[PDB]
From TrEMBL, chain B:
This is MexA family multidrug efflux RND transporter periplasmic adaptor subunit. The chain holds residues 136 to 187 of 442 of the full protein. Belongs to the membrane fusion protein (MFP) (TC 8.A.1) family. It comes from the Bacteria. It is found in: Cell inner membrane.
Length: 53, 52
């Protein structure tokens, strides 16, 4: 029972890693779009900092 | 009527007064709108230097 529980926990946490990498990529793309919109002048630094957080 | 007749007048000398009383009122209205939009522009001119 302990071996099966530990292996299934590893199998779950690797998929959690993959979904966290996908979420981080989405957040990085949003930050790049907000940085571009700050460079052209449409948005302000008040939005760039919230995108950085 | 702010002139005597049969005299010489210069350019821009005021001749009459035609009871403003309406033009004074909407001048007060336009000046009241200017007093808010000028402060808005003056505050945004300070804020845009730090990109706030």
């Amino acid at each position: 029972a302990s071996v099966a529980t530990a292996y299934l926990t590893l199998k779950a946490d690797q998929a959690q890693l993959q979904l966290t990498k996908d979420t981080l990529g989405t957040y990085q793309k949003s930050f790049d779009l907000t940085q571009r919109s700050y460079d052209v002048g449409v948005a302000s630094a008040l939005d760039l900092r919230q995108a950085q957080t | 009527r702010l002139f005597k007749e049969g005299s010489d007048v210069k350019a821009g000398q005021q001749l009459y007064q035609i009871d403003p009383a309406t033009y004074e009122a909407d001048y007060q209205s336009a000046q009241a709108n200017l007093a808010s939009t000028q402060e808005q522009a003056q505050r945004y001119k300070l804020l845009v230097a730090d990109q706030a």
